[PDB]
């Protein structure tokens, strides 16, 4: 996260770290959506152009974390993966359309002050909150600058951007399964996701029911916190039929 | 850079 | 989950984090 701040303790209890077993390193972010299901970006797990193709046994899910590198004894919980499910129409060839994946844990994780699931939006949730100028929150242990790494989880709040502005900022083909967020140069304020943050959540707190909803997944950006560029997020509500289908069929 | 984690998880 | 977007250290005990108000103020 560039131009963010240290998270408070228990501020994002759905935050998940995807951790590579060897070498031991941060792979991506992710989020907890139930006691057995974790949501992330498909490209964190599968990206053929760079010969990225993880299997269940290659990584671990670390939940309840705050410090990036420390083993947080008695606080974090480390979980093994039973199965990975990538969206069947994930477009890794072109623009990362439908950049979403689920992973089922071998065993249910116990909820605590530090570990708790985020809500997923329904149609009216999305219609009411996914509006230009409304702010969401992005969190992660990614880099602090495009060109180092944080001691603890970082947080930044960023406004949703108008669709024509998103489209005009990039040469990538943008689809309805994406939305962009970030400040414009004239707005002065800064902030963005960066390397290591992909797969993590873009959340919003409904003013109607005072619950946190995961509206986006950190998907891609052209550099980090560049003027005139914006971060792109998977639109979780638009892919929720797929999410439900997978959880309903595989538990 | 990452602290060693309990062997049980690997 | 019935509970779940309600954080144990914030919503569950009626405490607000340091920047959630920034989000609320953007929701017009
Ligand atoms: C070195 O570049 C970064 C690569 C990986 C990053 N993206 C990626 O893995 C993906 C797929 C391959 C190119 N990636 C990118 O995100 C590309 N950004 C990219 O290459 O930006 C360069 C960069 C430099 C330093 C830090 C971060 C990025 C992106 C792009 C869009 C417009 C023009 C050119 C490329 C693009 C989007 C869709 C399809 C193709 C290209 P990632 O932090 O998960 O994403 C973030 C996350 C946050 C901010 C920026 C990138 O983490 C791996």
CATH number, domain at C12? 4.10.140.10
Q: Which two tokens stand for residue C25?
A: 């103020």
Ligand 1 in contact with A222 (CB < 6 A)? yes
CA distance C9 to C20: 14
Residue ranges of domains in chain A:
1-12+118-237, 13-117+238-250
Domain of C14? 1-3+5-28
Give this entry's resolution in angstroms: 1.4
CA distance C2 to A178: 28
* Element (DSSP H or E) covering residue A217: strand A212-220
Q: Which of residues 178-197 of A touch C (CB under 8 A)?
A: none
CA distance A176 to A115: 32
Sort A27 into a burial class: Cβ within 10 Å, 0-12 / 13-18 / 19+. buried
CA distance A12 to A82: 24
CA distance A134 to A129: 7
Residue A9: Cβ within 10 Å count = 14
A207 in C contact zone (CB under 8 Å): yes
Looking at ligand 1, which atom is closest to the CA of residue A196?
43
CA distance A221 to A193: 8
Residues in C closer than 8 angstroms to A136, CB to CB, are 23
Q: Which two tokens stand for residue A60?
A: 């671990």
Q: Which of B1, B4, B9 sits opposite A60 (nearest CB)?
A: B9
Backbone conformation region of residue A133, classed left if phi is above 0, alpha if psi is from -120 to 50, else beta: left
User: What is the residue-wise DSSP string for chain A?
Assistant: -BS-EEPPTTS-TTEEEEEEETTEEEEEEEEE-SSSEEEE-GGGTEEGGGTEE--GGGEEEEES--BSSS--TTT-EEE-EEEEEE-TT-BTTTT-BT--EEEEESSPPPP-SS--PPB---HHHHHHH--TT-EEEEEES--SS-----SB-EEEEEEB--HHHHHHT-SSPP-TTEEEE---GGG----B--TT-TT-EEEEE-TTT--EEEEEEEEE-SSSS-TT--EEEEETGGGHHHHHHHHHHH-
From the CA atom positions of chain B, what is the Rg in Å? Answer: 7
Residue A10: Cβ within 10 Å count = 21
Q: Which two tokens stand for residue A198?
A: 């992909």
* A-chain residue closest to B5, CA distance: A71
From the CA atom positions of chain C, what is the Rg in Å? Answer: 11
Interface test with B, best of A20, A22, A78 (most B CBs within 10 A): A78
Instruction: Determine whether A198 is an active site residue.
Output: yes
Domain count, chain C: 1
Put simply, the answer to whether B3 touches A71 (Cβ < 8 Å) is: yes
CA distance A179 to A219: 10
Beta strands (DSSP E) in A58-166 are: 59-63, 77-79, 81-86, 101-105, 135-140, 154-159
| CATH of the domain spanning A13-117+238-250 | 2.40.10.10
- Tell me which fold the domain A1-12+118-237 belongs to: Thrombin, subunit H (2.40.10)
């Amino acid at each position: 996260i560039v131009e963010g701040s240290d998270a408070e303790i228990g501020m994002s209890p759905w935050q998940v770290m995807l951790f590579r077993k060897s070498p031991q390193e941060l792979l991506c972010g992710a989020s907890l959506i139930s006691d057995r299901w974790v949501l992330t970006a498909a490209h964190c797990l599968l990206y053929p152009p760079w010969d990225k193709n993880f299997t269940e046994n290659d990584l671990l899910v670390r939940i309840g974390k705050h410090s990036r590198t420390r083993y947080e004894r008695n606080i974090e919980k480390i979980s093994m993966l039973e199965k990975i499910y990538i969206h069947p129409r994930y477009n890794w060839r072109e623009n990362l359309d439908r950049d979403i994946a689920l992973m089922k844990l071998k065993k249910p994780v116990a909820f605590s002050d530090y570990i708790h699931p985020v809500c997923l939006p329904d149609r009216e949730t999305a219609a009411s909150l996914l509006q230009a100028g409304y702010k969401g929150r992005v969190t992660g242990w990614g880099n602090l600058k495009e060109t180092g790494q944080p001691s603890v989880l970082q947080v930044v709040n960023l406004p949703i951007v108008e669709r024509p502005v998103c489209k005009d900022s990039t040469r990538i083909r943008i689809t309805d399964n994406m939305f962009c967020a970030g400040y414009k140069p004239d707005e002065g304020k800064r902030g963005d996701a960066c390397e290591g943050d992909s797969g993590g959540p873009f959340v919003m707190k409904s003013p109607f029911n005072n619950r946190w909803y995961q509206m986006g997944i950190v998907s891609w950006g052209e550099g980090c916190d560049r003027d005139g560029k914006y971060g792109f997020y998977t639109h979780v509500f638009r892919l929720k039929k797929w999410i439900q289908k997978v959880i309903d069929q595989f538990g | 850079d990452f602290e060693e984690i309990p062997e049980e998880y690997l | 989950e019935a509970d779940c977007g309600l954080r144990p250290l914030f919503e569950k005990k009626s405490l607000e984090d340091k920047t959630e108000r920034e989000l609320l103020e953007s929701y017009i």
